[PDB]
Coordinates of C-alpha atoms in Angstrom, one line a residue:
Chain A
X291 CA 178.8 105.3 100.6
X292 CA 179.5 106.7 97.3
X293 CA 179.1 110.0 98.6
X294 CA 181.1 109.6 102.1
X295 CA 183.9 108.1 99.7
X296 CA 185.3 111.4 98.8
X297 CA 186.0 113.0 101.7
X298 CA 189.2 114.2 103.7
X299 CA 191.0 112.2 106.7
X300 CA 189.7 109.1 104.6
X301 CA 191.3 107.0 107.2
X302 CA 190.2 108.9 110.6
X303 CA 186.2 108.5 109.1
X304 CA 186.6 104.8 108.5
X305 CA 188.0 104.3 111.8
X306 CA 185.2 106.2 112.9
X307 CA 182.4 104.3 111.7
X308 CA 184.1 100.6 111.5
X309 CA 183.9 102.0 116.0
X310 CA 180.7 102.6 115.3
X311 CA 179.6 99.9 113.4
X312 CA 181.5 97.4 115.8
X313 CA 178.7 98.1 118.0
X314 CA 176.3 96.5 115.6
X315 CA 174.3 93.3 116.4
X316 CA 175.3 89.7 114.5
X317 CA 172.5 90.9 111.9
X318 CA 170.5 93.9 110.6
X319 CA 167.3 93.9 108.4
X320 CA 167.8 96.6 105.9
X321 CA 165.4 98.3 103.7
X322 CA 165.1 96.1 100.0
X323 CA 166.4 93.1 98.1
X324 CA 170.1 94.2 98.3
X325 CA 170.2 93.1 101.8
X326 CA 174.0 92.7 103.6
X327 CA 173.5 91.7 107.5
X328 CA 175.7 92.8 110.0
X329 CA 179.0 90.5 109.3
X330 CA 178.5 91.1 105.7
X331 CA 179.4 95.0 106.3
X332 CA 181.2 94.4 108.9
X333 CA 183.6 92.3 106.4
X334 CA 183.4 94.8 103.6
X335 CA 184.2 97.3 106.6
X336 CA 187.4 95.4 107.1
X337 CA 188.4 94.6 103.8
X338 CA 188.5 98.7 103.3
X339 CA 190.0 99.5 106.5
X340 CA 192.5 96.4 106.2
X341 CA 193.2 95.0 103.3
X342 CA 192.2 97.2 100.2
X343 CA 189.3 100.1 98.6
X344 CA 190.1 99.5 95.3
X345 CA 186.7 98.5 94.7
X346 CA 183.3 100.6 95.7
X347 CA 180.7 99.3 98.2
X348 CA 178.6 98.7 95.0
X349 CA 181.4 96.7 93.4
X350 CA 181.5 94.6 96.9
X351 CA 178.2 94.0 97.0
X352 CA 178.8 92.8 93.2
X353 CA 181.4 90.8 93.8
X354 CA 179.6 88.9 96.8
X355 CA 176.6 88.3 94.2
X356 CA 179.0 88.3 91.4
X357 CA 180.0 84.3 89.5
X358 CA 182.2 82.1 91.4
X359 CA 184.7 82.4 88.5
X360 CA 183.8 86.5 88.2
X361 CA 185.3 86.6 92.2
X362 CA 188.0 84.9 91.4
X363 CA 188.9 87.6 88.5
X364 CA 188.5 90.0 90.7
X365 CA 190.0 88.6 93.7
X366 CA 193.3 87.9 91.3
X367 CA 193.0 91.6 89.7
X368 CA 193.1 92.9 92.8
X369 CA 195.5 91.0 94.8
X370 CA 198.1 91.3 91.3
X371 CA 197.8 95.1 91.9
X372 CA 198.0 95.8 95.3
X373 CA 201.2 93.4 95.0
X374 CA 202.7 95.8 92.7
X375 CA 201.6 99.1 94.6
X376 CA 202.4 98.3 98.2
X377 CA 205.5 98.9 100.3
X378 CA 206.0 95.2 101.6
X379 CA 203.6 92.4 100.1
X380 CA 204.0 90.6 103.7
X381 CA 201.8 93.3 105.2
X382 CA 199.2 92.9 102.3
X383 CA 199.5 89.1 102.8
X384 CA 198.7 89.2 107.0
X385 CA 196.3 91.4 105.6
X386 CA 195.0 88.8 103.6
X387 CA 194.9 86.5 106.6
X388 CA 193.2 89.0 108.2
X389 CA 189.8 89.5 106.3
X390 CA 189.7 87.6 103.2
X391 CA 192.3 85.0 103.2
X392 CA 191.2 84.0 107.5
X393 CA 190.3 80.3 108.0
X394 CA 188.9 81.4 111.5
X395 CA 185.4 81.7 109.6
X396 CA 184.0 82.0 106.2
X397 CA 185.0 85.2 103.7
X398 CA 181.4 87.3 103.1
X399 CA 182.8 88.9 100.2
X400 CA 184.0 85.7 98.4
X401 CA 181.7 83.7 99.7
X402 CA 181.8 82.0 95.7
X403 CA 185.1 81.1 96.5
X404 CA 187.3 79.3 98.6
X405 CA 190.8 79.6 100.7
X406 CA 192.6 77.5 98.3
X407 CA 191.5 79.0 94.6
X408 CA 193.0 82.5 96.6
X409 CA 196.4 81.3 97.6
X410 CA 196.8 79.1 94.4
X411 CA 196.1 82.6 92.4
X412 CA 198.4 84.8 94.7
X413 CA 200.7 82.3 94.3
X414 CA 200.8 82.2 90.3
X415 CA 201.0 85.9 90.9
X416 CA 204.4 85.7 93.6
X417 CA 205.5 83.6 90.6
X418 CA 204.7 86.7 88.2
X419 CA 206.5 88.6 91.4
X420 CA 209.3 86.1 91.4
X421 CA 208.7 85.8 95.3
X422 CA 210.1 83.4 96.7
X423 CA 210.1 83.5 100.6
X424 CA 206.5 84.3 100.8
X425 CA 205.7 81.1 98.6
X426 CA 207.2 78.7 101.3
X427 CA 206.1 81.0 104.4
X428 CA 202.4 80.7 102.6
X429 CA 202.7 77.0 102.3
X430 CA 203.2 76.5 105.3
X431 CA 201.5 78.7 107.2
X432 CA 198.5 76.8 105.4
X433 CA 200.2 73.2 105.7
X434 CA 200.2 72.3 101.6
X435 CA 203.2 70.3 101.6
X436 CA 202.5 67.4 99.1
X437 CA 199.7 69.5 97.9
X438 CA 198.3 68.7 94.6
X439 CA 197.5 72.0 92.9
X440 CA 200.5 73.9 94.5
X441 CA 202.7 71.1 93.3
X442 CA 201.2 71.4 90.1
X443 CA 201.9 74.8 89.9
X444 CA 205.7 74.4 91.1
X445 CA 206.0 72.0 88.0
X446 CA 204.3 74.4 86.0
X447 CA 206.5 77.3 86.2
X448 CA 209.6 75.0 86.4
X449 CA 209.1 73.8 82.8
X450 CA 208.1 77.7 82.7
X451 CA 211.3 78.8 83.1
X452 CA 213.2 75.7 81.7
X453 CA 211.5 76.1 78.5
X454 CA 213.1 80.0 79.2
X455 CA 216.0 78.7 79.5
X456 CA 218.8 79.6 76.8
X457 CA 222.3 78.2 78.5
X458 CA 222.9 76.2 81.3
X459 CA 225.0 78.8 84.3
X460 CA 224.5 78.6 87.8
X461 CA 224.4 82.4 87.6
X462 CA 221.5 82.8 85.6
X463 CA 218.9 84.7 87.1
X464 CA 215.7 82.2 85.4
X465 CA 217.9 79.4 87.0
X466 CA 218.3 80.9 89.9
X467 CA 214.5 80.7 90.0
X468 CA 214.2 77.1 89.2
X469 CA 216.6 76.2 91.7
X470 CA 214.5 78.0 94.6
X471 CA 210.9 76.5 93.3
X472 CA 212.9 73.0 93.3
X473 CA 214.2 73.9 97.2
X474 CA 210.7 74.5 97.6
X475 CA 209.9 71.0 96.2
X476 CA 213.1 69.7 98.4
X477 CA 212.1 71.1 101.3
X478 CA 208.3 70.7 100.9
X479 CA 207.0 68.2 98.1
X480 CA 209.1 65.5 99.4
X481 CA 206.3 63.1 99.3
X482 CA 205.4 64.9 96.5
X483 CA 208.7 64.4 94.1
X484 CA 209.1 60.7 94.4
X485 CA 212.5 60.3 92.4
X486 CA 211.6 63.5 90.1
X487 CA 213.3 65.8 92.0
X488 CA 216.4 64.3 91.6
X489 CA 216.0 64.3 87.8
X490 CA 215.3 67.8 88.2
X491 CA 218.4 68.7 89.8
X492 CA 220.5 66.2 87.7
X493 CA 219.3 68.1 84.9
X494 CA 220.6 71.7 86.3
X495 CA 223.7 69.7 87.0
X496 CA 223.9 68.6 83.6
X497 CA 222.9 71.4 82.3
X498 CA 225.8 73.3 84.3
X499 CA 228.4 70.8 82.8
X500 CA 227.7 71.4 79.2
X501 CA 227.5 75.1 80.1
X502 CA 231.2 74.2 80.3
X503 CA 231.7 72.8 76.8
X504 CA 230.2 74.0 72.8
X505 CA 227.3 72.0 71.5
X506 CA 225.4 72.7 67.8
X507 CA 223.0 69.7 67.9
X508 CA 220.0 71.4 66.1
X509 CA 218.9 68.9 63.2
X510 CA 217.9 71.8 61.0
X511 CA 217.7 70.2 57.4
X512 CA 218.1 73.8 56.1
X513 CA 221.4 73.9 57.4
X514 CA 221.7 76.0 60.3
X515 CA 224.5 75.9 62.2
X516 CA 224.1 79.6 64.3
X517 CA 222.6 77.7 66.9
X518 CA 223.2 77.9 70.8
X519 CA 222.3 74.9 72.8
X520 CA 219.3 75.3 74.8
X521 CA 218.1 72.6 78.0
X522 CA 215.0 71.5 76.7
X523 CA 216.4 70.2 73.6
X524 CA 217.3 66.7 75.4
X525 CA 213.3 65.9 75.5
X526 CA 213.8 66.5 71.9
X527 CA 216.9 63.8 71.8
X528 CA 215.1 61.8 74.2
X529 CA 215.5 59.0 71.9
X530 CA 218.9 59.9 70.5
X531 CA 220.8 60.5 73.7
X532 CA 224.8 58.9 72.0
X533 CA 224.1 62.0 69.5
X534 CA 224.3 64.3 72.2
X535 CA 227.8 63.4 73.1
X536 CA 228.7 62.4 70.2
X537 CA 228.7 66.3 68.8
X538 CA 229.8 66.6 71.9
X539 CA 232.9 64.5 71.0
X540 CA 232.9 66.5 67.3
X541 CA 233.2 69.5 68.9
X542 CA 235.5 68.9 72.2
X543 CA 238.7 67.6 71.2
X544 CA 239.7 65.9 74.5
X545 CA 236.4 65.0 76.0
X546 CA 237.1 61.5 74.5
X547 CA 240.1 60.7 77.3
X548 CA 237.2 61.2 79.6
X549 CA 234.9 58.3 79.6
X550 CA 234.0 58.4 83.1
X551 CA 232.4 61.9 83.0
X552 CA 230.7 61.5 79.5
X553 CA 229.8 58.4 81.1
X554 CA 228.0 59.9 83.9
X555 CA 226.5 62.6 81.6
X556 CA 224.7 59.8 79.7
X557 CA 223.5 58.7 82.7
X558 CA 222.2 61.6 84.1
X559 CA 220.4 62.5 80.7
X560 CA 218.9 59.0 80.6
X561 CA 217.8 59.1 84.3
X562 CA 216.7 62.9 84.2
X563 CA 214.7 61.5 81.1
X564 CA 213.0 58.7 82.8
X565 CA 214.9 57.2 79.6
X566 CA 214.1 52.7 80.8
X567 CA 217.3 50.9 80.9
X568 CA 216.4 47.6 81.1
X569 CA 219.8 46.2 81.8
X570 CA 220.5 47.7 78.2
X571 CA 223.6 50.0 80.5
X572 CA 225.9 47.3 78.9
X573 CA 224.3 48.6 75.5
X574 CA 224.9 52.4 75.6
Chain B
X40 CA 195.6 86.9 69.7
X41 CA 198.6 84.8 69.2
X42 CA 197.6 81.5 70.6
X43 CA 194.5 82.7 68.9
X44 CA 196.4 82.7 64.8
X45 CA 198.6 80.0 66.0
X46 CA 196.0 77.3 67.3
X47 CA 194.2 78.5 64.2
X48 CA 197.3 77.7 61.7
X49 CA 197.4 74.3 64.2
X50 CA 194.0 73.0 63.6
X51 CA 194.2 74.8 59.9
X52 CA 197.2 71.9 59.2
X53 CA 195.9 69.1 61.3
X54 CA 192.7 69.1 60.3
X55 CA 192.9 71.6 56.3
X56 CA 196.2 70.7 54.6
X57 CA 196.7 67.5 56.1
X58 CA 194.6 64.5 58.3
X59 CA 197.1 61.9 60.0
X60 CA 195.4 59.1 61.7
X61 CA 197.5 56.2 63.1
X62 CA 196.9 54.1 59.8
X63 CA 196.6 56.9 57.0
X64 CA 198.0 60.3 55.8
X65 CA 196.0 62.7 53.2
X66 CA 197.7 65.8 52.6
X67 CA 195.5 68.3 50.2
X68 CA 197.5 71.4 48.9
X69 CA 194.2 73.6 49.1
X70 CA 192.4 74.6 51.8
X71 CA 188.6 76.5 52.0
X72 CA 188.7 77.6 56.0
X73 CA 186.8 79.2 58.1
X74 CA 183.1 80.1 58.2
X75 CA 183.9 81.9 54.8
X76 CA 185.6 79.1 53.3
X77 CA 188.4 81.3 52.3
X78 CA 191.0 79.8 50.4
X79 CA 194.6 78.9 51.2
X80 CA 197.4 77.3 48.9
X81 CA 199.4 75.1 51.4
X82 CA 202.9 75.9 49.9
X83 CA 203.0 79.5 50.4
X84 CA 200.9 79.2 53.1
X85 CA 203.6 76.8 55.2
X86 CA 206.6 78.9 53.4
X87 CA 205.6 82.2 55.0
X88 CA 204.4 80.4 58.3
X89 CA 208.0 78.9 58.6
X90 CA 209.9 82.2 57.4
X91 CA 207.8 84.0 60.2
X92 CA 208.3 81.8 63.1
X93 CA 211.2 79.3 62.1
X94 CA 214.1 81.3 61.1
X95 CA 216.5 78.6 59.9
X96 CA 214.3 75.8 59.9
X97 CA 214.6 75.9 64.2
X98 CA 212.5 76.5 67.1
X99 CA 213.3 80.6 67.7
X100 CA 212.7 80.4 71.3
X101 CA 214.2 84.0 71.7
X102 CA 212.8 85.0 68.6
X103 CA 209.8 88.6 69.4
X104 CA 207.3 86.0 68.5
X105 CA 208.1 84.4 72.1
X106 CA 210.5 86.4 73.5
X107 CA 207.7 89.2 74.1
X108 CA 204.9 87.5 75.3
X109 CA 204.3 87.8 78.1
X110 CA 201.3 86.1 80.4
X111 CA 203.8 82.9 81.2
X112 CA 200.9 79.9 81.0
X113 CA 199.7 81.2 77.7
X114 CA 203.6 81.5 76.6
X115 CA 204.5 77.9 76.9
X116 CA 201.3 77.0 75.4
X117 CA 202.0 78.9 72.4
X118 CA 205.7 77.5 72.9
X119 CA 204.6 73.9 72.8
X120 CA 202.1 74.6 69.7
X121 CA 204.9 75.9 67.7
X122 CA 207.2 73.1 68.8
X123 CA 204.0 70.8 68.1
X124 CA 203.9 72.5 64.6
X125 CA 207.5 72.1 64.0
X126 CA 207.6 68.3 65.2
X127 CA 204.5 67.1 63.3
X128 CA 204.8 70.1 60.0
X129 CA 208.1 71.5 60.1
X130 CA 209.3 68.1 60.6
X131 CA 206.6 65.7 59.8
X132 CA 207.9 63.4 62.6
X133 CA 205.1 61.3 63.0
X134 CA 204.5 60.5 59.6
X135 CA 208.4 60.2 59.3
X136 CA 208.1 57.1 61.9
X137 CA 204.9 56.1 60.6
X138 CA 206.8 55.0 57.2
X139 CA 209.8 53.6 58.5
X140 CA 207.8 51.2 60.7
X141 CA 205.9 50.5 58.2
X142 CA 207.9 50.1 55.4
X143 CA 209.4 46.7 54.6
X144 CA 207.7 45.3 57.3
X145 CA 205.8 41.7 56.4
X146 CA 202.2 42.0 57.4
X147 CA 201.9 45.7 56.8
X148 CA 200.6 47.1 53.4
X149 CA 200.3 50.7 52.2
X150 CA 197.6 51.8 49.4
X151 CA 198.0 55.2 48.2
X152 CA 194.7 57.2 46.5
X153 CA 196.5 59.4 44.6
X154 CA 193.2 61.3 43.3
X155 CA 191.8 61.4 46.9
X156 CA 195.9 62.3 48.1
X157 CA 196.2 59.2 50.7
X158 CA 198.9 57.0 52.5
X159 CA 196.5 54.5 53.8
X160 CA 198.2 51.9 56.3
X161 CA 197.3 48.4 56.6
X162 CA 197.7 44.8 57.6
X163 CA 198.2 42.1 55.5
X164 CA 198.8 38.2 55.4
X165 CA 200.4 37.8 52.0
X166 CA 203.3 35.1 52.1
X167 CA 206.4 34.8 50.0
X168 CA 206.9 35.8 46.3
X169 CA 203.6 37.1 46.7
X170 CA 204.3 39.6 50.4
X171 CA 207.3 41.0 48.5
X172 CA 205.2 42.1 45.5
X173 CA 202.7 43.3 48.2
X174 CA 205.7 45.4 49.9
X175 CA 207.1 46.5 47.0
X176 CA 203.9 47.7 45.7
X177 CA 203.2 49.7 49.2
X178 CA 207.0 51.1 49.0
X179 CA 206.5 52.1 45.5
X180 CA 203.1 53.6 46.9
X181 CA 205.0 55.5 49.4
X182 CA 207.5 56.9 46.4
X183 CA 204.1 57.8 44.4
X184 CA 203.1 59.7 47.8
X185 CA 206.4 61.3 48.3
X186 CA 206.5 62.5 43.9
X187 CA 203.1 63.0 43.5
X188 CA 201.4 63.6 46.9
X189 CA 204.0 65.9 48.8
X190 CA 204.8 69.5 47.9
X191 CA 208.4 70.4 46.9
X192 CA 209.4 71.2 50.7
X193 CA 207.5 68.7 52.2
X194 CA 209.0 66.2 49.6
X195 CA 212.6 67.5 50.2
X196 CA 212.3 66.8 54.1
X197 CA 211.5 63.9 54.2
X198 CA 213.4 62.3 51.3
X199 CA 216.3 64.2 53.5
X200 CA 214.9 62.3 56.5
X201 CA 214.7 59.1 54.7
X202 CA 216.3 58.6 52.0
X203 CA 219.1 57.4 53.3
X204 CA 216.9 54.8 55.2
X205 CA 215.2 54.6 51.8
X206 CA 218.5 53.9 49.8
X207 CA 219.8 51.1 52.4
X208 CA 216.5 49.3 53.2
X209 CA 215.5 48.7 49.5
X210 CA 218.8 48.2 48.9
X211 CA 219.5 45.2 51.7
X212 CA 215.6 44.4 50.7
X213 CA 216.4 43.8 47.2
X214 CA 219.7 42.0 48.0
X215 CA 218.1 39.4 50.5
X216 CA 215.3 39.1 47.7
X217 CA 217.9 38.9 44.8
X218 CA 216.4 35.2 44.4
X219 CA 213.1 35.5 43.3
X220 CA 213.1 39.0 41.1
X221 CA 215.9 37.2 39.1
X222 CA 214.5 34.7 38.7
X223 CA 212.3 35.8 35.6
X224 CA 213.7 38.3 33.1
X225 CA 210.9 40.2 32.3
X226 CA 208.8 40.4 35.3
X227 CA 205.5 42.9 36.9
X228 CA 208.5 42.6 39.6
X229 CA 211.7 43.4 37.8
X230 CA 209.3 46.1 35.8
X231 CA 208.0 47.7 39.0
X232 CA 211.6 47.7 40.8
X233 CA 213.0 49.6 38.5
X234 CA 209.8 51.9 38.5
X235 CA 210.7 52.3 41.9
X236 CA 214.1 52.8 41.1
X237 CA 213.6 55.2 38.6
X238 CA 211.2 56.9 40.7
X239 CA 213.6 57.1 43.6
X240 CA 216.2 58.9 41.6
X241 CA 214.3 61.4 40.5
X242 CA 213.1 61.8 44.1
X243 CA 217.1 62.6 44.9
X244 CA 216.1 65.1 41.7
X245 CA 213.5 66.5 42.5
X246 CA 214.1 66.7 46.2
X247 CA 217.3 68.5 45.2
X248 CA 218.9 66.4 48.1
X249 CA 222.2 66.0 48.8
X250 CA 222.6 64.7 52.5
X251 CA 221.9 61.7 50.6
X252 CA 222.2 60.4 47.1

């Protein structure tokens, strides 16, 4: 293999012998320990011709005997670079569903591995690609609405990007993101949200509305006062929400004619928070 | 690499410079860590570490230290350790709330080991006359702790934090207590207020602090 590797019409020769070896039985003794039947090459075959030759025959034959967790660095090596270097990922991802990533029977390759570690890791990696279509069109082309670890994941890069999250504008492109992965929540962990969602979405609405107003609540007993106000400092205030608007107050002149809004805003804040009010909305 | 120094400057505070349980505090300036037991002076130590990665005293979210990195799972876990570090070190929050539920609360004593460096926490079941000598006593601890246990920064936050908590609830403590501390005139009580009074003005010294006098 090593030495039919580097050779011309690449393609053409691996068309050739995948027609060849399609003729093969189910299995085939061959001559030592390092034995691959039948569907083993055959799978190997069609990972090359398909989906990728990044790695040699060798490193296949590795990789089937390699750790669970040693596939699974490979598989995500691979899969991350072959998302940067082809034309349209979609075509590397039917290819996926083609050889490694088909249900239809078991992968030969990463046989330490299953479906699910795969599409969680190209997923992380979409994330890393900031692809957002192919996320849903995955979930449910393999039915993981309310999934747990895809869910988990969602969540994961939300605070991700949250915690990236200097203003509060519509416009902003790590924003934009966390508004599609929560449409992915809306339209797919439904059952998987419970009230959280809403919270989430609050808080971009929230977050929006004092994108329209000057804030400088960063208790820096240094003194600083060259601060911006970023989202995640409201789990910071958790406790101190009335000092939120209260600067607000201290630093827009007229919000105080408008009680309903600031109103509101408190609310949102507490709610977004899971703040308990325990009939304690007369209090604040 | 960096969660790598930054976990290490994380378990070097929680578990070198300073041990907080949920009923004691020991702070130690000095520190021999590592398999070489090399040493570190806590004052610098926290001075550079806050210079470096809190610029003005805040969490520098867009700051090189975070704003390159990269790999996005480590990122926020490097994010939350600094915010951890800043909360518990840069801000000493749980030891802040520690104290004021603690202090001037009947039932709840504080010793402080001032050669072993230790707010220890405690219940107690003193009554009267003799439960405001006992609170007294663990305030006055809690000023020994802040003079003699802290280091200049770590005094000046938290008298900054508290201080004004400090004035009022000693204050309102003494008033509602006016009774029995006058009624002797030369008293361990009388004596040890004004210790602690003494002792609290030269924490507003000391601590430099102006927020609150």
């Amino acid at each position: 293999s090593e030495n039919l590797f580097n050779l011309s019409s690449l393609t053409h020769k691996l068309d050739e012998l995948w027609s060849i070896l399609s003729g093969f039985p189910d299995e085939i003794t061959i001559e030592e320990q390092k034995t691959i039947t039948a569907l083993e090459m055959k799978q190997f075959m069609e990972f090359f011709i398909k989906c990728s030759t990044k790695f040699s025959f060798k490193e296949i034959f590795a990789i089937t005997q390699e750790e669970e967790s040693a596939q699974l660095a490979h598989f995500s090596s691979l899969c991350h670079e072959e998302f940067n270097k082809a034309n349209e990922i979609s075509s590397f991802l039917q290819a996926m569903y083609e050889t490694v990533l088909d249900i239809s029977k078991d992968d030969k390759i990463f046989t330490r591995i299953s479906m699910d570690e795969k599409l969680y890791s190209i997923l992380e990696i979409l994330l890393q690609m900031n692809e957002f279509a192919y996320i849903e069109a995955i979930i449910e082309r393999f039915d993981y609405s309310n999934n747990t670890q895809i869910y988990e994941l969602l969540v994961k890069f939300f605070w991700h990007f949250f915690n990236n999250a200097s203003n509060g504008l519509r416009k902003e492109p790590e924003m934009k993101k966390a508004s599609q992965t929560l449409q992915i929540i809306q339209k797919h962990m439904s059952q998987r949200a419970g009230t959280n969602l809403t919270k989430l979405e609050v808080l971009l609405e929230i977050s929006d509305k004092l994108s329209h107003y000057s804030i400088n609540l960063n208790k820096s007993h240094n003194g600083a006062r060259d601060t911006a106000f970023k989202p995640s400092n409201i789990l910071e205030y958790r406790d101190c929400p009335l000092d939120i608007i209260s600067n607000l107050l201290e630093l827009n002149p007229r919000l105080y004619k408008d009680l309903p809004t600031t109103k509101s805003l408190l609310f949102g804040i507490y709610d977004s928070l899971s703040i308990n009010r325990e009939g304690q909305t007369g209090k604040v | 690499l960096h969660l790598e120094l930054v976990s290490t400057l994380y378990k070097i505070l929680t578990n070198g410079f300073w041990k907080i349980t949920e009923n004691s505090i020991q702070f130690t300036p000095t520190v021999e860590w590592g398999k070489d037991k090399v040493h570190i002076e806590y004052d610098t130590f926290m001075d550079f570490v806050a210079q470096q990665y809190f610029p003005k005293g805040s969490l520098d979210n867009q700051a090189w230290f975070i704003l390159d990195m990269t790999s996005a799972d480590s990122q926020e876990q490097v994010r939350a350790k600094l915010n951890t570090i800043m909360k518990e070190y840069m801000n000493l929050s749980r030891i802040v709330s520690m104290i004021k539920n603690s202090i001037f609360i009947s039932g709840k004593e504080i010793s402080y080991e001032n050669e072993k460096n230790i707010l220890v926490f405690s219940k107690s079941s003193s009554h009267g006359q003799h439960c405001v000598s006992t609170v007294l006593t663990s305030f006055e601890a809690v000023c020994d702790f802040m003079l003699d246990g802290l280091a200049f920064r770590d005094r000046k936050t938290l008298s900054y934090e508290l201080g004004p908590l400090f004035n009022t609830e000693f204050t309102k403590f003494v008033k509602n207590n006016a009774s029995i501390i006058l009624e002797s005139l030369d008293s361990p009580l009388k004596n040890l207020v004004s210790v602690i009074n003494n002792k609290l003005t030269r924490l507003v010294a000391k601590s430099e602090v102006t927020n609150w006098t």
